[PDB]
Amino acid sequence: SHMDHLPMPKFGPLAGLRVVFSGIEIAGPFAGQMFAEWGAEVIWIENVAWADTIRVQPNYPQLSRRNLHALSLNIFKDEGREAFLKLMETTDIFIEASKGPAFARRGITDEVLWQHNPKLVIAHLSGFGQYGTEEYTNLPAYNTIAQAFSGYLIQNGDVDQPMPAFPYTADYFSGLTATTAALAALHKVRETGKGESIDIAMYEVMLRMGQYFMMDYFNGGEMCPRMSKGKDPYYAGCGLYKCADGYIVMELVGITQIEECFKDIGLAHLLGTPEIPEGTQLIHRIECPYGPLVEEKLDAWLATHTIAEVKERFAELNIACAKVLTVPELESNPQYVARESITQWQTMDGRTCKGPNIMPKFKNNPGQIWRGMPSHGMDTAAILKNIGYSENDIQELVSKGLAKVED
Amino acid sequence: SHMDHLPMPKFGPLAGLRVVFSGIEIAGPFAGQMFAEWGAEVIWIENVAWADTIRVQPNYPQLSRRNLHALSLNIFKDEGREAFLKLMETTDIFIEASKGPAFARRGITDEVLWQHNPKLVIAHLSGFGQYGTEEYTNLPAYNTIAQAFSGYLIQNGDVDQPMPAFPYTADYFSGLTATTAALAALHKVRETGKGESIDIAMYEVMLRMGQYFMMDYFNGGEMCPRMSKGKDPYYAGCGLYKCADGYIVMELVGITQIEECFKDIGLAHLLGTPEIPEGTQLIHRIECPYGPLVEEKLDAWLATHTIAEVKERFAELNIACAKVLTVPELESNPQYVARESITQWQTMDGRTCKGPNIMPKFKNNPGQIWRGMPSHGMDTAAILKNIGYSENDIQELVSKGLAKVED
């Protein structure tokens, strides 16, 4: 009835949307919790005997589990499964992260889910997909493995040292993709009244994100080299450089930009040559015989100049650049301050917690932080009551080990 | 009327949705084109005198601009602005990437957009946001700058060499976020009938993606160190390692996993000590005095073993691992083959093009590739006719330099 709902402020583009997620750590819960940043009612399912392993992390979970309601229920066993499937009847979106088609193996097929709610949007997040070969389909999902398997890892790092993107980059791309896809499927529901199942394989997500140069390989050209110390694989004066008192990123692009920079770095005599003709806008480091010399002289000029000096000079010449900010430099940055990009909120246990604000910024229906990370099973009793369980019913579930209520 | 629509197959969760985007290169167009992967009608706006600079890229645009309709129109000038605002009247989502609030500066405020369509969802993608300080707000958007400004760059790379995530990682996270947020705002429209404006600042996107360890810094702990050659900052036996014939990623986690691996690598005598007690599941490299020795012996054992040998042994011990696949190894991988993860389609000029399939995989309404990348202004005439312009009207726009039709 009208009294049977979880209380929370009405806000955001997703007010009134009912999302439930089953999963631990980053990828799945990130996908689920994003809905909550933007106003949805999101229920975080944890197992009864053991909580989400994210909780071991000392601070991150205060951000990654904010705005959530906590259910602790064994969704695969007896009366716990009955409770889970009852919950599905009023759920709009269900997100789960598993080792392949684990839900189907345990008897909760999409068919079973749709029996309880034909409108349900189901997002399955896995390392290798819901179907494929016997060898790969049921393997564990890890960010490093997804990067390794997708060709993402091999293109990150230094010339002679590949490295993964950090931190847990594949988990975030995959989780975000799941949010996106579920919202898209939701659109279809609002016209047809028929749900959807989404097969998000982490390696396919990362495959797409690594295509900029890989498309050359697939279509008759060559795969790009890895960066050298964060410098562009192809274009001189682009990427990461070291100054006297820290790092900068820069983009040496444009006629006057190249002309005046060359003069500064002692290479004026290279201008107007066949190798660097009048009107050159971009220097290809491999194709141009002077590529390595340009880098040598650029490094030397930057090495003896401070970031402020470099920024001042690059501002004069309209060369796009930015200091590589260290973590201690973010909070006091005037743009961060003006936009309240880092904010504070209260934890459930009375402490001020610091971290990023809601992103992005919706004008008419902005997101907000309305509750800190909940404890294990904190909202179990309320959720079960809302879907028709008596106090006696809930007690029975708890004694049978099928649910856990508040600490 | 019913005859005034752009022809395309009905498919995907987003069939019938009308999306328009203004922008070049990656971030904005990636956001817009994703809608088209999943069935939406998406119109790509290009300037009249110059096309999207993405077109200079030899192969990537065949992937990044597939499934699109091409409009070439000067949306800020005279009759071109009139045409653009008329188009907005039947558009569901407008995405634009600009240097801050450039649209408002040029007279196309959100207020003006909503005058023509009060339901419109507007997504503004920029480097530093739609508001803030005079110093930062109107600066150019670059992937490297976003990584530098957000604390993402400083945490990627090697101990003594920071590097950006590759390729153009911030452009993809930011574009994807814009898609997600626009789809969320779309939900709100379908109940209230009122549109939304979304301020997606690239640095705020990347700020969120780099929080796993940064949340410790903000809340009384320490920022993590950078990885050493792709190895986990904290946990021994986790991350990237070099074998005899290539690289692997691994996860040394678990009691028997550590016990039997130690035996293999010549460290059996370290088991059952105060430093590595019976029942150790995870080795903290900094806290454990044997951390460096474990790495030394692990490197040595892996260095003399092939990937097949390592995989075979790690499969026996239930240690999660994967070969770092090179780009040439993807197509023939049995999982890629089974899932058709890499596919082919026809370009507009009659050639077979190779690249990733649609991701993710929707069960009931799968995405498909229905058209190759269009040419500059290819669909201008059709789009303008649909919104009420005569052949004479279009000719007038073309002669005035306000529109470009097909080559």
Which residues are CB-neighbours of A314 under 8 A, at least 6 positions away? Answer: A250, A320, A321
Quote the CA–CA distance of A331 and A337 in Å, as a whole number.
Answer: 7
- Kindly state the tokens that stand for A179: 């949010």
Taking alpha carbons only, the member of B92, B65, B72, B91 closest to residue B369 is B65
Quote the CA–CA distance of A265 and B294 in Å, as a whole number.
Answer: 47
Please check whether residue A280 is in contact with residue A340, taking contact to mean a CB–CB distance below 8 angstroms: no
CB atoms A14 and B187 under 8 Å: yes
Please check whether residue A21 is in contact with residue A31, taking contact to mean a CB–CB distance below 8 angstroms: yes
Out of A38, A178, A326, whose CB is closest to B184?
A: A38
Scanning B310-349 for CB atoms below 8 A from A yields 320-328, 330, 333-335, 338-339, 341-342
If one counts every other C-beta atom within 10 angstroms of the C-beta of residue A222, the result is: 9
User: Nearest CA to CA, how far is A204 from chain B (Å)?
Assistant: 7
Q: What technique determined this structure?
A: X-ray
Scanning B256-295 for CB atoms below 8 A from A yields none
Please check whether residue A352 is in contact with residue A343, taking contact to mean a CB–CB distance below 8 angstroms: no
Q: Is B6 left (phi over 0), alpha (psi -120 to 50) or beta?
A: beta
Q: Which domains does chain A have, with CATH numbers?
A: 1-228+332-407 (3.40.50.10540), 229-331 (3.30.1540.10)
- Kindly state the tokens that stand for B150: 């957000």
Helices A169-192 and A143-150, axial angle in degrees (round to 10)? 90
Quote the CA–CA distance of B182 and B30 in Å, as a whole number.
Answer: 13
Q: Which residues pair with B198 in a beta bridge?
A: A362, B123
- Kindly state the tokens that stand for A365: 């229906």
User: Nearest CA to CA, how far is A6 from chain B (Å)?
Assistant: 20
**Residue of B169, B219, B232 to mutate, testing the A interface (most A Cβ within 10 Å of its Cβ):** B219
Catalytic residues of B: 171
Which residues are CB-neighbours of A388 under 8 A, at least 6 positions away? Answer: A86
Sign of the torsion angle spanned by Cα atoms A131, A133, A136, A138: positive
- Kindly state the tokens that stand for A333: 């940055």
Tell me the chain A residues in contact with residue B356 when contact means C-beta distances shorter than 8 Å: 204, 207-208, 211
Quote the CA–CA distance of B23 and B39 in Å, as a whole number.
Answer: 20
Please check whether residue A340 is in contact with residue A349, taking contact to mean a CB–CB distance below 8 angstroms: no
If one counts every other C-beta atom within 10 angstroms of the C-beta of residue A43, the result is: 24
User: Nearest CA to CA, how far is A31 from chain B (Å)?
Assistant: 11
The enclosing H or E element of B307 equals: helix B307-316
Q: What is the CA radius of gyration of chain B?
A: 26
Quote the CA–CA distance of B388 and B372 in Å, as a whole number.
Answer: 27
Please check whether residue B139 is in contact with residue B127, taking contact to mean a CB–CB distance below 8 angstroms: yes
Task: Determine if residue B99 is labeled as part of a ligand binding site.
Answer: yes
User: Nearest CA to CA, how far is A158 from chain B (Å)?
Assistant: 8
Collapse the DSSP code of B199 into the 3-class scheme (helix H, G, I; strand E, B; otherwise coil) and give the result: strand
Quote the CA–CA distance of A170 and A308 in Å, as a whole number.
Answer: 35
Query: How long is chain B?
Result: 407
The 3-class SS string of A241-269 reads EEECCEEEEEECCCHHHHHHHHHHHCCHH
Quote the CA–CA distance of A188 and B183 in Å, as a whole number.
Answer: 11
Quote the CA–CA distance of B76 and B69 in Å, as a whole number.
Answer: 20
Quote the CA–CA distance of A250 and A254 in Å, as a whole number.
Answer: 13
CA angle (B295, B299, B303) in 5-degree steps: 175
Residue A278, Cβ density class (10 Å: 0-12 exposed, 13-18 middle, ≥19 buried): exposed
The runs of H, that is alpha helices, within B17-168 are 27-37, 60-64, 78-88, 102-105, 110-116, 143-150
Quote the CA–CA distance of B142 and A134 in Å, as a whole number.
Answer: 42
User: How many Å separate Cα B86 from the centre of its chain?
Assistant: 31
Look up residue A180 and give its amino acid. Answer: T
Scanning A52-81 for CB atoms below 8 A from B yields 57-60, 62-64
A vs B, Cβ pairs < 8 A, gives: 431
Q: What is the CA radius of gyration of chain A?
A: 26
Pairing outcome for strands B161-162 and B157-158:
antiparallel
**Omega within 30 of 0 (cis) for the link into B289:** no
Q: Which residue is closest to B35 within chain A, CA to CA?
A: A184
Quote the CA–CA distance of A15 and A11 in Å, as a whole number.
Answer: 6
Helices A291-303 and A255-265, axial angle in degrees (round to 10)? 70
CB atoms B198 and A153 under 8 Å: no
Task: Determine if residue B208 is labeled as part of a ligand binding site.
Answer: no
Out of A205, A341, A353, whose CB is closest to B207?
A: A341
- φ, ψ for residue B8 (rounded to 5)? -175, 150
Please check whether residue B376 is in contact with residue A209, taking contact to mean a CB–CB distance below 8 angstroms: no
Residue A89 contacts B, CB cutoff 8 Å: no
Quote the CA–CA distance of B155 and B168 in Å, as a whole number.
Answer: 16
Quote the CA–CA distance of A95 and B281 in Å, as a whole number.
Answer: 29
The 3-class SS string of chain A reads CCCCCCCCCCCCCCCCCEEEEECCCCHHHHHHHHHHHCCCEEEEEECCCCCCHHHHCCCHHHHHCCCCEEEEECCCCHHHHHHHHHHHCCCCEEEEECCCCHHHHCCCCHHHHHHHCCCCEEEEEECCCCCCCCCCCCCCCCHHHHHHHHCCHHHCEECCEECCCCCCHHHHHHHHHHHHHHHHHHHHHHHHCCCEEEEEEHHHHHHHHCHHHHHHHHCCCCCCCCEECCECCCECCEEEEEECCEEEEEECCCHHHHHHHHHHHCCHHHCCCCCCCCCCCCCECCCCCCHHHHHHHHHHHHHCCCHHHHHHHHHHCCCEEEECCCHHHCCCCHHHHHHCCEEEEECCCCCEEEEECCCCEECCCCCCCCCCCCCCCCCHHHHHHHCCCCHHHHHHHHHCCCEECCC
